Amino acid sequence: GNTVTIDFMSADGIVPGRTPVRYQGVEVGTVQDISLSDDLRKIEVKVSIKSDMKDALREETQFWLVTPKASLAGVSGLDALVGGNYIGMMPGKGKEQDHFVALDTQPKYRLDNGDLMIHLQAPDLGSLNSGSLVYFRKIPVGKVYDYAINPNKQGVVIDVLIERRFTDLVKKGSRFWNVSGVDANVSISGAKVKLESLAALVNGAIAFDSPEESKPAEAEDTFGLYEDLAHSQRGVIIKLELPSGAGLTADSTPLMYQGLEVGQLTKLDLNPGGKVTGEMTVDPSVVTLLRENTRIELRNPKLSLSDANL
């Protein structure tokens, strides 16, 4: 077979003879040996590519080191029980190059298998990582490919890869929400905690929905990752100038209509002039009741010793 020299910054995890160099699953090359440079400043790894894939290491062939994703077995010790840290390779355009520089992260998604790659803006990564599942009706239809930091450092961008036979689900009006960790709630007569998804509890997950009247999403389309299922709920956003938010909370303050909750507070700000404004998301079923002469009244719970409404 052939032979090539890659330049790594740290030969940790790479062992000669064992570590493979695979392209989209199939093993291709094998690490021959690791050796320090003359100045002992960069690591030169020798790889033995197959004698048939001599046209893949042309000029732009990128090599990088992968990891077993560290899913509850790498964090809790157990080093010699997971993964092999292979060397991912992506073929290039054209040259006779035989000395490469290892990339510090895997490149963009250049493949084309009819499966979607969409982007999700987020304020932060949450408890996601490469390998977190994307769900539709709690059916796994994709996975988090990789995440990057937004150029303006204001958020992160996650890359979700929806598998081929499910690309009809991602409509242009879909909504992705984070389902991660545990949501143990406690109240009085109602301190009920239910947990069903285990993988979401370990390495997080995303979920999405699909309206039935919007066009299918194209590749590299951008959505926004909501914090939870509740924050993703549709409904009209109305603005309130409320007197002073005292018992009000940014969420969990309902808009009751005949005892049925038909909305919630979603924003509770403090304007410069001392005025406390807010924003409330209203169920689309009662938007027809938001007219000129419709009041929205703060109401306090009375004792009412008759019923006492505990």
Place this chain on the structure above:
Amino acid sequence: GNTVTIDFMSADGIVPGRTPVRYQGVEVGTVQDISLSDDLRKIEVKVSIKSDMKDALREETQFWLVTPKASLAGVSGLDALVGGNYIGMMPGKGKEQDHFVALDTQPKYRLDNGDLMIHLQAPDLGSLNSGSLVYFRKIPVGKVYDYAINPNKQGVVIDVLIERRFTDLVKKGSRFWNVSGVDANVSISGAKVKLESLAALVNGAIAFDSPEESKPAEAEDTFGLYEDLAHSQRGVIIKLELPSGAGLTADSTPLMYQGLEVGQLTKLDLNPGGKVTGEMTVDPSVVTLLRENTRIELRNPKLSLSDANL
């Protein structure tokens, strides 16, 4: 290859033929055999360095013993399931030395790969250790290199190693806060516990932020590790001479402004003259309201059987 004799204080974990002697990942030497000294007082380990790295063991080449970091798999027994305890080596300046003394800890960070090394002062280590991750937007961008005790014994100094492609994040006005363990909170109608980061729960973590108007941090720059995300919040620190702190707590005592919390007590001391002074951090949005004729009033919650404000 060559051959050298290192002087260890305890040959525990070192096994002949198996334990390697690696420099920044790449295996170089191999432990030939362990033998006691003539007086049976110090351990002489024989190492077989490669025949090409004969200019690395010059005079100042430092050798030390490493460990698999004891992450939930070394503490819970499981001895023969993690790590190999290799011998780290750092090349020296110049001589023909062939008999070394093992260092009891790894030396300073002398490398230069364009990646940052910053220092974090702390009152104590917290639940951190070599290998705890440093996060930006919950994206791992670094790791705790090693920790030392401050010369004056008053605190500890942690050494954080921010990777190369992320050094633009650490601004000179950044703020690092400890994210470690679990923060299970319980209240009445609100006893909500959420956990997302698993590695932070096991072996702790640090997180930091990045202002958009300060210069990038240089190497060996010093920051202060805050206790949590809350203690790191920016805002102006005002001083109060309060009458007697009775219902006040060092934290979790808000400064309400029209029902919206715009500050908190952060310090609650007792001066010698019997005067109880305090310090309160105020949201930078209401600093313009801190003028000469602005009062700050203690207020107790009334029954108010109408609403009762539970």
